[PDB]
Every structure is written in structure tokens, then in C-alpha cells.
Ligand binder design. Structure first.
Ligand SMILES: O=C(Cc1cccnc1)Nc1nnc(NC2CCN(c3nnc(NC(=O)Cc4cccnc4)s3)CC2)s1
Ligand SMILES: O=C(Cc1cccnc1)Nc1nnc(NC2CCN(c3nnc(NC(=O)Cc4cccnc4)s3)CC2)s1
Lengths: 410, 410, 410, 409
């Protein structure tokens, strides 16, 4: 016996050779993408042999085995229906009506704080899925770049905990939501910002990453880090949005100066420089496809699902997902933690970085904000998602009424 | 083939009959207890045949089939390692070290608010486990009764949601934590108490249960409900602490009068009576074993693990562990949700009703409280439990560092 | 060939004969109810032959032919999927999600003008469907009686036109919406009330039905008419709300006196009597199921869908849905006609008698009104219904984007 | 089996030749025209073969399948009587007497506001039909050009909603009829014009189409759009009527200035320029044949029936037909909505752009207006049309007394 031939016969279906197109649509139907980095040796040796013998698209038992030999384990799990969502193509059908039912929520106002987020169309709306096994799906404006704005706050918090540890990082920032009037206090009773998901806490966290080095290297360090979270998909930077947050952030200068007064940074901090490094991290660009892999990295204990690389410590991922649970959606956070129960994080460009732990990561994006600062279609979509599947933090995996469980068979 | 004899041959050893004592120690090894209600028919048929032959206590393939036939389904998955914790014997050993390393915490103050919760010894300490499949283990003072006090707050909330629905119940009480700033206000900004786990909201929740009938019937109904949650194990009532909580609750009279003047009850409420019903519900007695079954009912989507009866709707259990996560441990709730990540609920008698969703339910009890009102040994124990197993709400089930996962084998 | 044998084998599945329950569940799957009046000969001879041999309960070619022969035309088209909605069982599933998402609409104020509409619970909520072919479905509090109030205005208008004709009836009442400046004037520029759906016009309409006869017979005639419109389902009368609307309708007395002054009644009118008759018609009781059949008569050209009886002339049906289109939802009529595009009529009890011409009739009921006077959940439902299917008056039956069309197969 | 011969055998009538005229008159009898754009490949190859062996007008089994092969789907539905109106030739017979009894309205007065609508004869009267499947018929003066005047309001409203969407567009214009003591207020209570079908509302919608660009491009953009709506039939422009409407529209200037005062345009609007663009859009020319195809695109969910192209989004068509229902016939709208129940739009030149949804589009035209501004022969025709068939918005498709159903056999 051998898994290469075991896999060979499962696609061969009693015939003696496999057309390679029949193999890739079998592959593409599992939800994997042929561009997947863990499939690259196999696609290399398929493209080589559809050159080697350009006659017959067809593959004998060793022509198949020489091609899938080096990734065979991940193709067995794909074809033996062992991915976390086994019937991925029903799931994407469901994603599609969830996307298309959120698509007709009219309302919201595009953030017009700066000329750069007024430049985005209200009818843009994209959602991208990446599961803990690399299965992907997108619908809508998923390859359109936009800035994370404060979707970067969990990502930089995780990096800070990864290099520094929870105890150090939480000498300087709290771990609870403020209370839903204190939309306007900077510090809790211990003179620490309430948590890493508010501006005062984010600014303090930004002050802890890669100390002792200038703002050019730190930005690279976070970008090197954000690159691996996305399995090297698109992570960019829009200098346009940086310059306009550069002279329209009197609040962050207010927070920055208030924090310097009450001695909330580590010794030797250049506060004004930390604000610029902060403003830059907010102008970093992604698409929903790029970002959903970042989200799935958090869904997968800190391992990038499409590379197998250890990006974040499990301690870092854990803290980041518990604070996104409770403080991730501005004033809607408690309502969100009750009704949706998923770690999510919103940003003013229209992003919602969503994580369904142990299953998948997501990014939803539509620029029209509601009156608390959260993308309207994102909020609607994430409600309909939990109303349809047992993904809520406190749904039961055995008795879940008439919800769906994409993790299961029939 | 047939499952009854298959089970016969796995116990029989290739030998020709099974001593009845070896069947029961094999049974107890899975963590079940012979008193299990879903095992009643099978233990009935053992007591019948241990009358027939008062020596020759060994059992045929056929007579083994005679007793186990009618509970064979849950006896096989018991013996095929298909319970949520398959190696239950080691897990309780680990529970045992956790219990006995928490046992050495000197500190804490026994509640002396009343002559009845001060009359309890500081050295009592009991921990009880019930898994979603019915496996049980206890260590320490697990069978001595004590009152839930405000461990009953999630339970009566669940009942309320069960009968009325989330939308009705949350016309009258919020669903967010108040904030470690607004721990001293009675109402949120919408003139509703912040959440069902603080006295102002609990009192309001108590006013919604089974309206239109007098307080004697109401108490009976909550007691019937608490009976099903515990699989008909011990739930009692201490008239002593009822009289001493009626004699010292100017706190609740203040809250009640404020809620009654401010139009926060449903119309036709006899507020002063509701306070008595409220005081009554807090004086209800349990043991840690009884209460852990109550807890496991919540861990199990609303099905009592030792009877299989659907007690609470999944909507009620989901909401109840969602509010226990964010508002369950008084001012320690945010620190608790961060470090422990389990829905828990504390009470001044020394109780912590703990839930590991999809795994197990628990009750720890030791009357010495810390200065936030939480049992000292209870808090220490749940820190050590999550520090040892990947039970935290946002641990990953695949990559989890140096933690242990009792759900798996080798 | 034979129409009965053809049906026999289509259900028999090639097997022996048909268990009587298999035919009955097959029947209910088309959406008809065994209570259907045009099915009653077939059900008479079903229980007639289930006394024949108290156990079979299986049915030959010629005993199946024995029962269905006399309704065979209506049963084959039901079983040949030829009703206006062929796959009725998903459609009701969809109605079910529509009902359950509107059920979460918090808002509204229950009418407290009278002690009789304040007595209703804010959470009562029912929706029920009857198609032009008699297929029925219900969800929620559909069997609870409530008064039509001014849902009766289209019905009595229809009665009036049926007996007198369009030209006579519109000597006394207009046929346009007044305009959202003239929501508060009684007469249009021709000294006629603007249309039959506002109180002055309804009051005038009440003055033309069965003139020359006393008010006791007049009420009987309208009740006989409403009986036929509902296929003899529930139509009642609340003398409480009648007595309470006559003691508090100074508005209507003002209207009556003004119309009497300006000579807007037919000669020989006892105006004060017509007001009493008008108040009576507003206190007529229905349930959502009864009233939805009334609606379905209007969807069906004036033929009762569950009896085949011609109740209203097509001239009356056209005009009444033409006026319900433009003047039916008080001040919300123009906004409703735009977005919903369905003839509807709202009433203060919380009813919306809604009609999808050529498809189905409906009645939704929830007592919370919004501040234009229309049931909140009723309005939300009719928004989502049209947001989901191509039922809007000026949707296209061929190119309709991603809307659904329950009228079609695949 | 295969469709070309199934069609061949249905026309051949068991015989072995088809004269080409027998196929073509069979074709016209369905109401299609040989000029139909979705038939031109079949007609190109038809007289190609009446050139190849140009004596012998007859068609073998293989020669018929060479000619009809690329348009076969639309040729079978035509011949299997599967168009929305199957007996088109009786229906047009009915259209003929409906036209001919309306020819008998003496009355009305021709618009003489400008010398260009006074130059038209009161006895001009044309009606043209285009069904949602492209079947056509006309009677009378159907090839005579005239301007849309305010027949353009539904068309440009649709263009705006197609590009802008319902919610944006109705930030600037209401969606209700005002009420008929209020044929004279400019703005409703939210300071928006009542609806896109009155001059103040139309002027505002004209201000939302293709903002930020010059007036020549804007006009071209609307002209390209109207061209697709008519399947590239006649859409013109009367520069004469433009000069006389810019010369005599002080109320529109009155309206324009009032709307400027009350902040009713989007920021950066050159109002006086928007009026000029508005005056141009009103002087755009059509015939009743061209215009009936425009109507049928609205009858057909936004697809031009004689080209198959998607021109308007289904949302745009829906909104434009709801507002033509209720505000389309000036002060006569409510009476028209009641008795006729069809989305229609009238114009000062004498046109009525009529739509029977899911069936057909129409344009009736006779310049004599009545005292509310609607062509008398137009209004009379549309009463008798609905008086004869179950086309009213709230007729029943199953029980309709003694009316006709041209949709049925
Ligand atoms: O006469 C015609 C025909 C016609 C055609 C052409 C020219 N003229 C007449 N129609 C009429 N029908 N009913 C009439 N008499 C009623 C007296 C009782 N109501 C009221 N009276 N006063 C009121 N005040 C306010 O509402 C305050 C307010 C708020 C907002 C706007 N305005 C006012 S409401 C209704 C009127 S007149
Ligand atoms: O006000 C709002 C908001 C609003 C809407 C609705 C209710 N409440 C508030 N909208 C407005 N739209 N237009 C306005 N001003 C223009 C002034 C120029 N015209 C005229 N002037 N005078 C005129 N009367 C006559 O011709 C003859 C006549 C007849 C009857 C009585 N009296 C006189 S028409 C056009 C209107 S205000």
C-alpha cells in the first residue's frame, strides 16, 4: 500500500489514468487554491510534465505519484474529507447568500474625516474566508486595497505580547472594556488605558514594539510580521492616508500628551515619534483576501494556514482574541459579544477582522459606517453568519437547535 | 454480530464469563457511577440476578446481554473511549492535584454578614466534576450543603429566557458589564440594570419568572426547574439564611424601591414580595456534586448529562454563559474573563459555578472569600485549571503550547 | 386512462396500495389542509372507509378511486405541482424566516386609546398565508381574534361597489390619496371625502350599503358578506370595543356632523345611526387565518380560494386593490406604495391585510403601532417579503435580478 | 432530432420546398419584423442564397437549416407561438379599432406656448406597439418626429437610479404625488421636490446625472443611453424647440432659483447650466415607433426587446414604473391610476409613453391637449385599451369577466 496510489485510485474512479484538469477541479473543489504555498512542488512538477509530454492531459499511476509525492500528506487530508469544513462548497454557497443579503443594507455614511476615505464608493462590499486548513472563498470587492486603520490594533497587540509577554505589556495597558459611557476617558483607575483596542491603549502598545530603534526599522519589523501572518499575500502602505491622519489627529496628540504627563510610556520614549509610527501602522494597506489569512492565523493558534509557519505565540493569539471579543467593536462591543460572540475588530475604512476560532478567519469590508463606527454590511453580515451556524463562542457543538454546523457531514 | 456480545467479549478477556464485580469496576473506570439514571434498567437487572444465584456471581454472554441490552448504547461508547474525556482516571488525578494545591491557600475571610454564612468553617473545600457525558469525580467536602446565594443568578436568568425569550427578558435588563467605574450604579443609561448577574438585574429577572401566580407556586416552579438541571440530585432550602437575608438587605430594598419607582418591573409587580422571592432564591441549598450537574447541564447545550432530558433551550444556555463570561465574578469579571476565559458565577457562601462548554460542568466551594467577594481557593483552582488545560475560551484546539488536552488519548 | 388511476399510481410509488396517512401527508405537502371545503367529499369517504375495516389501512385502485373521484380535478392539479406556488414547503420555510426576523423588532406602542386595545400583549405576532389556490400556512399567534378596525374599510368599500357599481359609489367618495398636506381635511375640492380608506370616506361608504333597511339587518348583510369572503372561517364581534369606540370617537362625530352639513350622504340618511353602524363594522373580529382568506379572495378576482364561490365582482376587486395600493397605510401610503408595491390595509389593532394579486392573500397582526399607526412588525415583514420575492407591483416576471419567484419550479 | 428541421417541418407542411415568402410571411405574422436586430444573420444568409441560385425561390431541408441556424431559438419561440402575445394578428386588429375610435375625438387644443408645437396638425395621431418579445405594430402617423418634452422625466430618472441607486437619488427627490390642491408647490415638507415627474423634481434629477463633466458629454451620455433603450431606432434632437424653451421658461428659472435657495442640488452645481441641460433633454426627438421600444425596455425589466441588451437595472425600471403609475399624468394621475392603472407619462407635444408591464410598451401621440395637458386621443385610447383587455394593474389574470387576455390562447 501507499498513500500516493491510495489517492491515485480515489480520483481515478476505476479508470486507469487521471486527466490533470479532473485533478485540479477535484482540488479546487476542496477549496484549496492551486497557488497555495504548500502545493507548490506539486504544481511545479505538474507544469513540468505537461511540458515533458505535451500529448494527452493524462497521468498514469507513477506520473501522478511523482507529481503529488512531496505534498502527499496535505492532499490526502484534502481528498479524504479531513479539512475542518469538509463540504466546503455548500459553505461557500451559504457565504454567498450571507454576503448577498448583507449587500442590500442601504444605510451608513462613508468616513469623510479625510479626503482619502471619502474617495471610496459606498457600494464596495467584500468578504473573504480562510479556514484553518487553507480553504478559501471570496465574493465581491475582495481584491481592493484599503487601510486597516484600527484593524491593526489587535495585530500589533499580538506582536507586542509575542516579543514581550503578557505581564510586561499589561504593565502599560488594561484588559477590560471601559464601561459604555467611557467612550471618552483615556485611563482606568490604575492610570493605564483601558485595553489595547482603544486609541489610548493602541498608542501605548505601539510604544512597546522593538524599542531602541528608529521609526523606519520598527515599521519594517511590523511589516515583516504582518507579511508572515498573511502567508506573504498583500500587505502594503498608503502614504496618502498617513499624511491626512498626520494633521487631523489632535485627539491622538491629546492622548499622546496626556499619556506623557501621567508617565504611561516606557522610559526614553519619543512620544511625538510614537504618534507618527502609530499613524503609519493605521495606514497599512490590505485587501479582504490578504486580511482574511491574517485573521485565520489568529483562528489557528498563530500558525499561518497557507504556509504552516509559526507567526505568533499561542499566548499572544489567546490574549488578542479575548480582547477582540470584549473591546473590538467600539461601543457596540458588548452587544456584539452577546449576540455574535466572535472575536472581531472594526476599522473606520469599513473593515471587520473576524475570527471564528478553530475554524476560519475572515475580513468583511464595506466603507459605509454606522453611527457607532462599524461597517453596516459587516455588522449585518456577522449577525446573519451566527444566526445561521453554531460558531458563536457559547453555542454548543452537540445540541444547537436548527443552526448549521459546517464542521460536520450529514 | 451484535453490540451486546461485542461488549461482552471486550470485557470477558477471551474468558468464558464476567464476574459482576469486574463489570462494575470496568464501569466505574469510565468515570460513570452505578447510580447513573440512564443506567437504571441495567443496574436493576443486576440486582435481580444477584438474587437468583447468591454464588456463581459470574455472567454468561446471554445473561450479560440480559442486563445490558437496554442501556447498551451508552455502555458501549463508555467502553469504546468515546466520552468527551476518554482517559477519565488520569484527568481526575489532575483534578486531584489542582484541588490539593489550591487547598493550601490560607487566606480569605468567611462572610460574617449573617450569623449563617459565618457559622461555616474556613477549612471546608470541595470540588466536583460532571462531564457532558456524565463522568463524575469529587474530592473534599463535596456532599455538605450550602446556599447558591448569587450562583443562582445565571440559573434563574436561564429559566427566564427559556420561558420568555431573549427579546422579552432584555426589555428589562441589559446584556453588558457595567464597568469597573459603574459598579455602584443601579441602572444603565437606558434605565435597565446592567446585566442579569448583578443584584439590580437579578431582582428584575426574578420579577419576570412565572408571573400572575403567587410566590409559593413561583418558588416551587424554580425548584422543579433546579431539580431537572441537577438530574434530581440534592437541591434544598435554608430558612435560616432566608430570614437573615430578609433582615439585612437594605441594599436590595434600596435597589428594589429605586427599580419599582423608576418603572423597571413589568406592570402588576408586587415589588416588596419580589424581594422575598429574590431572598428565597438566594437561600436555596445545593452541594458541589448537585451543582456540578447543574453546571454540566449548561456545558451541554441544555441537556442534563445524567438523564438526557432537554431542560433549557439552547438560546437560554447560550445567553447565560455569555453573561457569565463578561459579568460573572463581580469586579473581578474582566480579569477573570482574560486569564481564565470560562463562564463562571460566584456566590458569597464560597461557591463558583464553573462551565467548560462542550466538556464538563463544575462547582467549587470554600467559604473564605477575597476582598472582591470570590472564594479564594475557587479562584486559585480555576487559574490552575486553565494554566494546565486548553479549556480557556480562546485557546486553540490544535496548537496549544505546553498545555494538556483531556479530550484526547496519546 | 383515468384521472383517478393516474393519481393513484403517481402516489402509490408502484407499491401495493396506499396507506391512508401517506396520502394525507402527501396532500398536506401541497399546502392544502384536510379541512378544505372543496375536499370534503373526499375526507367524508376517507373516515367513512376507515370505519369500514378498522385496520388496513391501505387503499386499492378502486377504493382510492372511491374517495377522490368527486374532487379529482382539484387533487390532481395539487399533486401535478400546478398551484400558483408549486414548491409550497420551502416557501413557507421562507415565510418562517421572514416571521422570525421581524419577531425581533422591539419597537412600537400598543394602542391605549381604549381599554380594549391596551389589553393586548406587545409580543403577540402572527402571519398567515392563503394562496389563490387555497394553500395555507401559519406562524405565531394566528388563531387569536382581534378587530379589523379600519382593515374593514376596503372590505365594506368592496361590498358597496359590488352592490352599487363604481359610478354610483364614487358620487360620494373620491379615488385619490389626499396628499401629505391634507391628511387632516375631511373633503376634497369636490366636497367628497378623498377616498374610501380614510375615516370620512369610510363613514360615507358605510352610508351606502343596503340603504332603506335598519341597522340590525345591515350588520347581518355585511356579516353574511364577510362570511363568504372568508370561506366561513372565523368572523366575530367585540361588543366591548364597540361600546368603547362609540364613547370616544368625537373625531368621527365631528366628521359625521361636517359631512351631514355639507350634504355628502344619500338622501334619507340617519347620520347618527350610520356612525353607530360604522363603529360596529370597525369592531368586527377576525384572526389572521380567517382574515388572510378574506385577503386571498381579493387576490383571486373575487372568488373565495377555499370554496370556489364568487363573492365580489371583478369591478369591486380591481377598485379596492387600486385604492389599497395608493391610500392604504395612512400617511405611510406613498412610501409603502413605492418600496413595497403591494395593496395593503392597516388597522389600529395591529393588522395589515395584505394582498399579492394573482398569488396569495395574507394577514399580519402585532399590536405595537409605529407613529404613523401601522404595526411595526407588520411593516417590517412586508418590507422583507418584497425584498425577497418579485412580488412588488412593478417587478418584472422575467428579469428580476437575484430576487426569488415562488411561482416557478427550478 | 434537432430544432432546425423541427422548425423546417412545421413550416414545410409536409411538403419538400419552402418558398422564401411563405417563410417570411409566416415570420411577419408573428409580429416580428425582418429588420429585427436579432434576426439579421438569418436575413443576411437569406438573400445571400437568393443570390447563389437566384431563380428557384425554394428551400431544401439543408438550405433552411443553413439560414436560420444562428437565430434558431428566437425563431422557434416565434413559431411555437411562445411569445407573450401568441395571436398577434387579432391583437393588432383590436389595436386598429382602438386607434380608429379615438381618431374620432374632435377635441383638445394644440400647445402654442412656442411656435414649434403650434406647427403640428391636430389630426396627427399615431400609436405604436412593441411587446416584451419584440413583436411590433403601428397605425397612423407613427414615423413623424416630435419631442419628448416631459416624457423624458421617467427616462432620465431611470438613468439616474441606474447609475446612482435609489437611496442616493431620493436624497434629492421625493417619491409621492403631491395632492391636487398642490399642483403648485415646489418642495414637499422635507424640502425635496415631491417626485421626479414634476418639473421641480425633474430639474433636480437632471442635476444628478453624470456630475462633474461638461454639458456636451452629459447630453451624449443620456443620448447613448436613450439609443440603447430604443434598440438604435430614431432618437433625435430639435434645436428649434430648445431655443424656444430656453426663451420662455422663467418658472423653470423660478424653480431653478428657488431650488438653489433651498439648497436642493448637490454641492458644486451650476444651476443655470442644469436648466440648459434640462431644456435640451426636453427637446429630444422620437417617433412613436422609436418611443414604443423605449417603453418596452421598461416593460421588460430593463432589457431592450429587439436587441437583448441590458440597458437599465431592474431597480431603476421598478422605481420609474411606480412613479409613472402615481405621478405620470400631471393632475390626472390619480384618476388615471384608478381607471387605467398603467404606468404612463404624458408630454406637451402630445405623447403618452405607456407601459403594460410584462407585456408591451407603447407610444400614443396626438398633439391636441385637454385642460390638464394630456393628449385627448391618448387618454381616450388608454381608457378603451384597458376597457377591452385585462391589462389594468389590478385586474385578475384568472377571473376578469368579459375582458380580453391577449396573453392567452
Ligand atoms: O374645503 C375643502 C375644499 C377646498 C378646495 C380648494 C380650496 N379650498 C377648499 N376641504 C375641506 N375639508 N374639510 C374642511 N374643514 C375641516 C375642519 C377640521 N380640520 C381642521 N381644521 N383646522 C385645522 N388646523 C391645523 O391642522 C393646524 C395645522 C397644521 C398643519 C397645516 N395646517 C394646519 S385641521 C379639517 C378641516 S375644509
Ligand atoms: O412650504 C413647503 C413645505 C411645505 C409643504 C407642505 C406643507 N407645509 C410645508 N413647500 C413649498 N413649495 N413651494 C413654495 N413656494 C412657492 C411659491 C411660488 N408658487 C406659488 N405662490 N402662490 C401660489 N398660490 C396660487 O397661485 C393660488 C392660490 C391657491 C390656493 C390658496 N392661495 C392661493 S402658488 C409656488 C410655491 S413653499
Amino acid at each position: 500500500p501507499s498513500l500516493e496510489d491510495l489517492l491515485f485510485y480515489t480520483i481515478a474512479e476505476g479508470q486507469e489514468k487521471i486527466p490533470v484538469h479532473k485533478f485540479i477541479t477535484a482540488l479546487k473543489s476542496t477549496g484549496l487554491r492551486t497557488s497555495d504555498p504548500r502545493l507548490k512542488e506539486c504544481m511545479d512538477m505538474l507544469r513540468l510534465t505537461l511540458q515533458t509530454t505535451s500529448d494527452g492531459v493524462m497521468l498514469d499511476k507513477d506520473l501522478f505519484k511523482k507529481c503529488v509525492q512531496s505534498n502527499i500528506v496535505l492532499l490526502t487530508q484534502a481528498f479524504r474529507r479531513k479539512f475542518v469544513i469538509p463540504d466546503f462548497m455548500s459553505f461557500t454557497s451559504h457565504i454567498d447568500e450571507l454576503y448577498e443579503s448583507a449587500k442590500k443594507q442601504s444605510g451608513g455614511k462613508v468616513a469623510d474625516y479625510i479626503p482619502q476615505l471619502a474617495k471610496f464608493s459606498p457600494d464596495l462590499w467584500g468578504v473573504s474566508v480562510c479556514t484553518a486548513d487553507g480553504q478559501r472563498h471570496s465574493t465581491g470587492d475582495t481584491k481592493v486595497p484599503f487601510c486597516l486603520q484600527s484593524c491593526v490594533k489587535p495585530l500589533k497587540y499580538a506582536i507586542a505580547v509575542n516579543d514581550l509577554g503578557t505581564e510586561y505589556v499589561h504593565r502599560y495597558v488594561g484588559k477590560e472594556p471601559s464601561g459604555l459611557r467611557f467612550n471618552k476617558l483615556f485611563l482606568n483607575e490604575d492610570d493605564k488605558p483601558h485595553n489595547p483596542m482603544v486609541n489610548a491603549g493602541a498608542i501605548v502598545v505601539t510604544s512597546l514594539i522593538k524599542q531602541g530603534v528608529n521609526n523606519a526599522e520598527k515599521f519594517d519589523y511590523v511589516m515583516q510580521f504582518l507579511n508572515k501572518m498573511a502567508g506573504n499575500e498583500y500587505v502594503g502602505f498608503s502614504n496618502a492616508t498617513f499624511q491626512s491622519e498626520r494633521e487631523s489627529g489632535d485627539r491622538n496628540f491629546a492622548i499622546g500628551y496626556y499619556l506623557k504627563e501621567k508617565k504611561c510610556f516606557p522610559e526614553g520614549t519619543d512620544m511625538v515619534g510614537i504618534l507618527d509610527f502609530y499613524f503609519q501602522l493605521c495606514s497599512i494597506e490590505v485587501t479582504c483576501e490578504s486580511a482574511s489569512v491574517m485573521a485565520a492565523t489568529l483562528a489557528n493558534g498563530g500558525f499561518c494556514p497557507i504556509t504552516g509557519e509559526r507567526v505568533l505565540s499561542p499566548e499572544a493569539v489567546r490574549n488578542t482574541l479575548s480582547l477582540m471579543h470584549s473591546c473590538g467593536m467600539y461601543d457596540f462591543s458588548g452587544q456584539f459579544a452577546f449576540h455574535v460572540g466572535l472575536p472581531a475588530k472594526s476599522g473606520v475604512a469599513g473593515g471587520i477582522l473576524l475570527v471564528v476560532p478553530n475554524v476560519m478567519g475572515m475580513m468583511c469590508w464595506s466603507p459605509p459606517l454606522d453611527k457607532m463606527g462599524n461597517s453596516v454590511k459587516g455588522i449585518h453580515f456577522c449577525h446573519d453568519l451566527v444566526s445561521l451556524c453554531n460558531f458563536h463562542n457559547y453555542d454548543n457543538l452537540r445540541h444547537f437547535a436548527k443552526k448549521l454546523d459546517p464542521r460536520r457531514e450529514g
